Enzyme design. Sequence first.
Site, mmCIF file in Angstrom:
data_model
loop_
_atom_site.group_PDB
_atom_site.id
_atom_site.type_symbol
_atom_site.label_atom_id
_atom_site.label_comp_id
_atom_site.label_asym_id
_atom_site.label_seq_id
_atom_site.Cartn_x
_atom_site.Cartn_y
_atom_site.Cartn_z
ATOM 1 N N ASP A 75 -8.389 -9.493 2.544
ATOM 2 C CA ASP A 75 -9.014 -8.502 3.411
ATOM 3 C C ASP A 75 -10.445 -8.883 3.774
ATOM 4 O O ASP A 75 -11.034 -8.262 4.664
ATOM 5 C CB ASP A 75 -8.990 -7.115 2.763
ATOM 6 C CG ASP A 75 -7.657 -6.393 2.968
ATOM 7 O OD1 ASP A 75 -6.826 -6.871 3.766
ATOM 8 O OD2 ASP A 75 -7.446 -5.340 2.324
ATOM 9 N N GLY A 93 -0.360 0.781 6.023
ATOM 10 C CA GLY A 93 -0.165 0.177 7.323
ATOM 11 C C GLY A 93 -1.214 -0.856 7.680
ATOM 12 O O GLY A 93 -1.295 -1.270 8.841
ATOM 13 N N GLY A 94 -2.016 -1.275 6.702
ATOM 14 C CA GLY A 94 -3.095 -2.209 6.966
ATOM 15 C C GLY A 94 -3.953 -1.733 8.118
ATOM 16 O O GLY A 94 -4.461 -0.613 8.102
ATOM 17 N N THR A 146 0.830 -1.204 0.000
ATOM 18 C CA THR A 146 0.000 0.000 0.000
ATOM 19 C C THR A 146 0.865 1.254 0.000
ATOM 20 O O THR A 146 1.965 1.257 0.542
ATOM 21 C CB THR A 146 -0.910 0.042 1.241
ATOM 22 O OG1 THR A 146 -1.425 -1.270 1.491
ATOM 23 C CG2 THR A 146 -2.085 1.005 1.022
ATOM 24 N N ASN A 206 -2.389 -4.714 -1.811
ATOM 25 C CA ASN A 206 -2.450 -5.310 -0.476
ATOM 26 C C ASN A 206 -1.023 -5.541 0.005
ATOM 27 O O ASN A 206 -0.362 -4.575 0.388
ATOM 28 C CB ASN A 206 -3.288 -6.588 -0.393
ATOM 29 C CG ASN A 206 -3.463 -7.049 1.040
ATOM 30 O OD1 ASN A 206 -3.243 -6.263 1.963
ATOM 31 N ND2 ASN A 206 -3.863 -8.305 1.240
ATOM 32 N N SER A 225 -11.638 -2.444 3.722
ATOM 33 C CA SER A 225 -10.319 -1.827 3.701
ATOM 34 C C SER A 225 -10.114 -1.008 4.971
ATOM 35 O O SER A 225 -11.069 -0.655 5.664
ATOM 36 C CB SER A 225 -10.162 -0.921 2.473
ATOM 37 O OG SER A 225 -8.879 -0.309 2.457
ATOM 38 N N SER A 226 -8.854 -0.740 5.297
ATOM 39 C CA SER A 226 -8.525 0.224 6.338
ATOM 40 C C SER A 226 -7.976 1.522 5.770
ATOM 41 O O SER A 226 -7.656 2.435 6.539
ATOM 42 C CB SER A 226 -7.517 -0.370 7.325
ATOM 43 O OG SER A 226 -8.079 -1.509 7.988
ATOM 44 N N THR A 255 -3.303 0.224 -3.513
ATOM 45 C CA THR A 255 -2.533 -0.898 -3.001
ATOM 46 C C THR A 255 -2.749 -2.162 -3.824
ATOM 47 O O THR A 255 -3.784 -2.352 -4.464
ATOM 48 C CB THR A 255 -2.924 -1.157 -1.557
ATOM 49 O OG1 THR A 255 -2.042 -2.138 -0.991
ATOM 50 C CG2 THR A 255 -4.365 -1.647 -1.465
ATOM 51 N N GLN A 273 -5.868 -8.788 -2.653
ATOM 52 C CA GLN A 273 -6.845 -8.105 -1.816
ATOM 53 C C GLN A 273 -7.859 -9.050 -1.183
ATOM 54 O O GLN A 273 -8.520 -8.653 -0.217
ATOM 55 C CB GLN A 273 -7.590 -7.040 -2.626
ATOM 56 C CG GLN A 273 -7.721 -5.702 -1.888
ATOM 57 C CD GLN A 273 -6.373 -5.016 -1.742
ATOM 58 O OE1 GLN A 273 -5.938 -4.690 -0.634
ATOM 59 N NE2 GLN A 273 -5.682 -4.831 -2.869
HETATM 60 P P1 LIG Z 1 -1.270 -1.801 3.058
HETATM 61 O O1 LIG Z 1 -1.342 -0.730 4.199
HETATM 62 C C1 LIG Z 1 -2.681 -2.992 2.984
HETATM 63 C C2 LIG Z 1 -3.935 -2.168 2.914
HETATM 64 C C3 LIG Z 1 -5.079 -3.213 3.113
HETATM 65 N N1 LIG Z 1 -5.190 -4.198 2.039
HETATM 66 C C4 LIG Z 1 -6.374 -2.423 3.178
HETATM 67 O O2 LIG Z 1 -6.952 -2.162 2.098
HETATM 68 O O3 LIG Z 1 -6.675 -1.996 4.314
HETATM 69 O O4 LIG Z 1 0.132 -2.690 3.035
HETATM 70 C C5 LIG Z 1 1.475 -2.205 3.332
HETATM 71 C C6 LIG Z 1 2.400 -3.163 2.573
HETATM 72 C C7 LIG Z 1 2.279 -4.569 3.150
HETATM 73 C C8 LIG Z 1 1.627 -2.329 4.871
HETATM 74 O O5 LIG Z 1 0.838 -3.081 5.467
HETATM 75 N N2 LIG Z 1 2.560 -1.648 5.588
HETATM 76 C C9 LIG Z 1 3.550 -0.618 5.266
HETATM 77 C C10 LIG Z 1 3.402 0.397 6.451
HETATM 78 O O6 LIG Z 1 3.067 1.517 6.107
HETATM 79 O O7 LIG Z 1 3.625 0.080 7.643
#
Ligand SMILES: *[P@@](=O)(CC[C@H](N)C(=O)O)O[C@H](CC)C(=O)NCC(=O)O
Lengths: 190, 349
Positions: free
Chosen positions: A43, A93-94, A1, A21, A72-73, A19, A40
Amino acid sequence: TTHYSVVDKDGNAVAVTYTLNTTFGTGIVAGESGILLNNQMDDFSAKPGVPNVYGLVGGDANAVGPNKRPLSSMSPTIVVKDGKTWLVTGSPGGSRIITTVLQMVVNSIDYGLNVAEATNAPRFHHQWLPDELRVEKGFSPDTLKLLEAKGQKVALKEAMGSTQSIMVGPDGELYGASDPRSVDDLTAGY
Amino acid sequence: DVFHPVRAKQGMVASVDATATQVGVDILKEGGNAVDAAVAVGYALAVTHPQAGNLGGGGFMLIRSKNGNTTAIDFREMAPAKATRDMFLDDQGNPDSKKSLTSHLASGTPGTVAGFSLALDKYGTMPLNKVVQPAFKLARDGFIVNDALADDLKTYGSEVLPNHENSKAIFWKEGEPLKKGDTLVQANLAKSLEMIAENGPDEFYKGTIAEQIAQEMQKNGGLITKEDLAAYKAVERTPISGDYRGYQVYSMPPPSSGGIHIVQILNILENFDMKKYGFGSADAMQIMAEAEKYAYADRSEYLGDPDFVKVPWQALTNKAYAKSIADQIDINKAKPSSEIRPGKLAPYE
Ligand SMILES: *[P@@](=O)(CC[C@H](N)C(=O)O)O[C@H](CC)C(=O)NCC(=O)O
Ligand SMILES: [Ca+2]
C-alpha cells in the site's frame, strides 16, 4: 479486507475495517503461531507514479519509510442524523472502498433507500487512474448509453465490496443489511 | 420494498461471517457493550475468516458512544525500522510486485492485537480473556468450512498457501485446499489466542508470538524484528468528518485516505440536486464519476502517514474548494483524467 458493524442496546456504535491486504495476505504463517502475515507494504508507493495492486499511485507522501504507516483506503464510517448515530457502515475493496461507502451514504440520504435497498443497489467507481468508469452488472443499457455519449469509458467488472451496515431508527429500533456480493455472511440481533 | 433489512430492538451485529456475527450477538446478550462485541467479532474473524480477519494484519476502528463522543483507533501496520524507500525496486529500478505482495518483505508490523486492546481497555467493559474465548474455542475445536472459505481457499489460497510449509499444514489437506464440509482446526492459532488471553497483548508484541514472527522473518529474509514488535503502538486519532445536507459524516483520518475523500466528494456532490436526478440516472452517475476523479487525483499527492507528512486535510475538506471543483463538472461532457491534476490548495489553507 473485511468490515463489520456493531450497535448495542445503549446506542453505542462501532465500525471496524481490518485486513491482511490481499486475500490471505502473503499466505505466510509466522512460524508455529498459526498467524497469517499481511502484505500491507504494497500500500506504499514503491516508486513515484507506478501503480500498486489496486491501481493507486503516489509519491513522497506515501513513499516507503521506516516505522511509517502505509496509506489505506479503509473507511469505517458513521453518519449522524438529528444528532444521533444513524448509519454505521464500511466495506472492503481497496481503492473502491471510498466510492462504495460514498454510495451507501448517497443512497441513504439523497435517494431515501432503506439500508437493505442501499446495500443491494448496484455500484460504479472512477478512481482517476486508470481512466475508466467501472460499473457492476445492474445498470440500465439506456443509462450506460447516455454515459458513453457523455464521454465516460464504461468498463463492466467484478462485483465491488461487502458492506455490512446498521441503520438506527428514531425510536432506537435497529435495521441491518449484509451484502449480496458475499455469501455466508450475516446481520443478526436481538 | 423489494429489499428488507434485518430488524432488532436491542443490539445488532453485521459481519462477513455467520459464526463471527453470532459471537458478537452473544457478547451483547451477555452484557458486553459495542466495543466488547466488536473486539470479540474481530478475534473470531481471525479464526473463521482467515482471508482477511486477522491477528497478523491491521486496520481501523470508528467508535461513537451513546453520548456522541466519536473517535478513531489507528491500528495500521508500521513498516519495519529497516524498511527503506527503494526496498521493492529490482536492480533496474522498477517495482517488483512479488517482493511487495508474496515475499517476507511484504509485511508490516501487525497492529490488530494492539488496536483491539487499546479500544477494549479504554472503551470496553470486559476483560480480554472473555472476548478472546469464543475465537479460542473455534481455533481449538474447529468449524466447518463453508462455501465462502472453500471458494477463497481454492481461488486465492492456491496462489500462496501451499508454497509455505506451515501454511500448507493448516489450510491444505490431501494435496488440495480444504473443501466445503471439511473441518478446519487451528491448534497453533488456538495456542496463540490462549496466550494472548492469559498474558495480554504483550504476548503478541513481546512474548512467544513476537519471537515466532521475528524468527519467521529472520529465517527468510524478512525485516520485522522484536524491536519492531516492541515499538508498535495503536494510536487514537481525531475522526475526519463533514456535513452533507445537515447529516454529519465521520470516518477515518490519515493514515487512511478514506474519510478525507468521502467528505471531499460529498462536499462536491452537495452542490447538485442528487435527489432530483435519482439512483441509476446517467446524470447522477456522471456527476459522481467526475467528482471522484478530482479526489483520487488529490489522493495521489497529499495523503500519507500524518506522523511523517503534513496532510492538508482542512483544505481537502473545505467546502469552497469543493465548490471550485463542482463548477468544473460538465454534466454532459466527462473530463479526461489526463486533464486532471491534484488541486491547488493554497487559497484554502
Ligand atoms: P482490501 O479492501 C485491501 C485494503 C487495503 N490494503 C487498504 O488498506 O486500503 O482487500 C480485499 C481483498 C483483496 C479487496 O480488495 N476486495 C474485496 C471487495 O470487497 O471487493
Ligand atoms: Ca450475503
